[PDB]
Design an enzyme around this catalytic site. Structure first.
Site, PDB file in Angstrom:
ATOM      1  N   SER A 105       3.190   2.754   8.165  1.00 50.25           N
ATOM      2  CA  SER A 105       3.011   1.779   7.040  1.00 50.25           C
ATOM      3  C   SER A 105       4.368   1.326   6.507  1.00 50.25           C
ATOM      4  CB  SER A 105       2.262   2.413   5.883  1.00 50.25           C
ATOM      5  OG  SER A 105       0.999   2.779   6.271  1.00 50.25           O
ATOM      6  N   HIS A 149       0.850  -1.232   0.000  1.00 50.89           N
ATOM      7  CA  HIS A 149       0.000   0.000   0.000  1.00 50.89           C
ATOM      8  C   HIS A 149       0.870   1.260   0.000  1.00 50.89           C
ATOM      9  CE1 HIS A 149       0.083  -0.040   4.573  1.00 50.89           C
ATOM     10  NE2 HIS A 149      -0.065   1.258   4.420  1.00 50.89           N
ATOM     11  N   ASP A 171       0.109  -7.658   1.354  1.00 51.48           N
ATOM     12  CA  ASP A 171       0.481  -6.267   1.482  1.00 51.48           C
ATOM     13  C   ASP A 171       1.998  -6.145   1.685  1.00 51.48           C
ATOM     14  OD1 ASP A 171       0.395  -3.502   1.642  1.00 51.48           O
ATOM     15  OD2 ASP A 171      -0.576  -3.378   3.565  1.00 51.48           O
TER      16      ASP A 171
HETATM   17  C1  LIG Z   1      -2.185   3.880   5.244  1.00 49.09           C
HETATM   18  C2  LIG Z   1      -3.427   2.949   5.295  1.00 49.09           C
HETATM   19  C3  LIG Z   1      -4.068   2.646   4.152  1.00 49.09           C
HETATM   20  C4  LIG Z   1      -3.663   3.033   2.887  1.00 49.09           C
HETATM   21  N1  LIG Z   1      -3.312   3.348   1.863  1.00 49.09           N
HETATM   22  C5  LIG Z   1      -5.245   1.694   4.132  1.00 49.09           C
HETATM   23  C6  LIG Z   1      -4.952   0.234   3.589  1.00 49.09           C
HETATM   24  C7  LIG Z   1      -3.872  -0.444   4.177  1.00 49.09           C
HETATM   25  C8  LIG Z   1      -3.586  -1.737   3.798  1.00 49.09           C
HETATM   26  C9  LIG Z   1      -4.346  -2.429   2.904  1.00 49.09           C
HETATM   27  C10 LIG Z   1      -3.985  -3.767   2.653  1.00 49.09           C
HETATM   28  N2  LIG Z   1      -3.671  -4.824   2.445  1.00 49.09           N
HETATM   29  C11 LIG Z   1      -5.424  -1.802   2.279  1.00 49.09           C
HETATM   30  C12 LIG Z   1      -5.688  -0.458   2.610  1.00 49.09           C
HETATM   31  S1  LIG Z   1      -7.076   0.282   1.766  1.00 49.09           S
HETATM   32  C13 LIG Z   1      -7.767   1.314   2.726  1.00 49.09           C
HETATM   33  O1  LIG Z   1      -7.684  -0.792   0.897  1.00 49.09           O
HETATM   34  O2  LIG Z   1      -6.419   1.101   0.606  1.00 49.09           O
HETATM   35  N3  LIG Z   1      -5.748   1.409   5.512  1.00 49.09           N
HETATM   36  C14 LIG Z   1      -5.013   1.707   6.608  1.00 49.09           C
HETATM   37  O3  LIG Z   1      -5.408   1.449   7.738  1.00 49.09           O
HETATM   38  N4  LIG Z   1      -3.920   2.553   6.488  1.00 49.09           N
HETATM   39  C15 LIG Z   1      -3.203   2.704   7.661  1.00 49.09           C
HETATM   40  C16 LIG Z   1      -3.437   3.688   8.597  1.00 49.09           C
HETATM   41  C17 LIG Z   1      -2.722   3.688   9.763  1.00 49.09           C
HETATM   42  C18 LIG Z   1      -1.621   2.807   9.988  1.00 49.09           C
HETATM   43  C19 LIG Z   1      -1.355   1.831   9.022  1.00 49.09           C
HETATM   44  C20 LIG Z   1      -0.246   0.802   9.259  1.00 49.09           C
HETATM   45  F1  LIG Z   1       0.311   0.293   8.179  1.00 49.09           F
HETATM   46  F2  LIG Z   1       0.704   1.331  10.040  1.00 49.09           F
HETATM   47  F3  LIG Z   1      -0.653  -0.214   9.979  1.00 49.09           F
HETATM   48  C21 LIG Z   1      -2.181   1.789   7.879  1.00 49.09           C
END
Ligand SMILES: CC1=C(C#N)[C@@H](c2ccc(C#N)cc2S(C)(=O)=O)NC(=O)N1c1cccc(C(F)(F)F)c1
Ligand SMILES: *[C@@H]1O[C@H](CO[C@@H]2O[C@@H](C)[C@@H](O)[C@@H](O)[C@@H]2O)[C@@H](O[C@@H]2O[C@H](CO)[C@@H](O)[C@H](O)[C@H]2NC(C)=O)[C@H](O)[C@H]1NC(C)=O
Ligand SMILES: *[C@@H]1O[C@H](CO[C@@H]2O[C@@H](C)[C@@H](O)[C@@H](O)[C@@H]2O)[C@@H](O)[C@H](O)[C@H]1NC(C)=O
Length: 218
Positions: free
Chosen positions: A173, A41, A88
């Site tokens: 992330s 992602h 991911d």
């Molecule tokens: C940054 C972020 C996203 C994006 N782009 C989103 C997401 C993350 C992972 C996946 C998978 N596999 C899918 C998405 S989504 C929302 O389908 O685009 N959902 C999600 O919760 N976040 C996110 C927010 C806060 C922390 C984190 C992490 F990676 F630190 F855990 C991730």
């Protein structure tokens, strides 16, 4: 990282900051001198020609001579399926090799298929947000979490901090989850937003992908 503390400088020498236009946008982990891994992602809609891969960093708001900076030569993907929250993980091939030293070291990975049970103690980390109205890390943050299987798919390693509001957040992330000194996770998503205190955080399960990683790094 919400509810964490500063890492000691350079405690986690495989920790990587991916940046664009000088800004941190995701963590990664150094898995060979010339390969990093991160979350798919993190790179899905990014301009990869412009991504800078920053090794040897601690305090992002400083000029740091310990840093080594690479471009991405190519990416390797493995069926990232965001709607289903599967695979991911990406590997980025660097445009050269890191010089290994005190501040820049290649991480160690588990065996293919290793599962961690409930209660395993790990460390999360990153340069993400610190939570509602508490700004953003300068200095790498780390955080003690515990592996949990409840409220977690088998296609993730999940973690939770019991009794308080803490976890990974935006910008964390792609960062490693280190368990028994091995990279068992790559920060993937949160549920109830950051540090709900209700739902575990979810990491891409590195041990499910070691065969694929080895197929690239050898
Ligand atoms: C940054 C972020 C996203 C994006 N782009 C989103 C997401 C993350 C992972 C996946 C998978 N596999 C899918 C998405 S989504 C929302 O389908 O685009 N959902 C999600 O919760 N976040 C996110 C927010 C806060 C922390 C984190 C992490 F990676 F630190 F855990 C991730
Ligand atoms: C909080 O985390 C630290 C670090 O965790 C260890 O190292 C991580 C990088 C990862 O491998 C984790 O799975 C490991 O648990 C814990 O520090 C360890 O504590 C024990 C004694 O309790 C000691 O013998 C080790 O040397 C420590 N390791 C390091 C690198 O310092 C710490 O205990 C955890 N604290 C709590 C309360 O959970
Ligand atoms: C590898 O790339 C290094 C960094 O390149 C810089 O960052 C990339 C993302 C672009 O923004 C580009 O304009 C910059 O030059 C170089 O400094 C380094 O020498 C390159 N190494 C090679 C080709 O071995």
């Amino acid at each position: 990282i919400v509810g964490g503390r500063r890492a000691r400088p350079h405690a986690w020498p495989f920790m990587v900051s991916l940046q664009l236009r000088g800004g941190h946008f995701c963590g990664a982990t150094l898995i060979a001198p010339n390969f990093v891994m991160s979350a798919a992602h993190c790179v899905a809609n990014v301009n990869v020609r412009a991504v800078r891969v920053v090794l040897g960093a601690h305090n992002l708001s400083r000029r740091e001579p310990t840093r080594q900076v690479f471009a991405v030569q190519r990416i390797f993907e493995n069926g990232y399926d965001p709607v289903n929250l599967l695979n991911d993980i990406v590997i980025l091939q660097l445009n050269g090799s890191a010089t290994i030293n005190a501040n820049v070291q290649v991480a160690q990975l588990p065996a293919q298929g290793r599962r961690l049970g409930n209660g395993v103690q790990c460390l999360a980390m990153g340069w993400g947000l610190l939570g509602r109205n508490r700004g953003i890390a300068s200095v790498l943050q780390e955080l003690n979490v515990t592996v949990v299987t409840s409220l977690c798919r088998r296609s993730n390693v999940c973690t939770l901090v019991r009794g308080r509001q803490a976890g990974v957040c935006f910008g964390d992330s792609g960062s490693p989850l280190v368990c028994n000194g091995l990279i068992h996770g790559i920060a993937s998503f949160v549920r109830g937003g950051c540090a709900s205190g209700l739902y575990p955080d979810a990491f891409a399960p590195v041990a499910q992908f070691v065969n694929w990683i080895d197929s690239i790094i050898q």
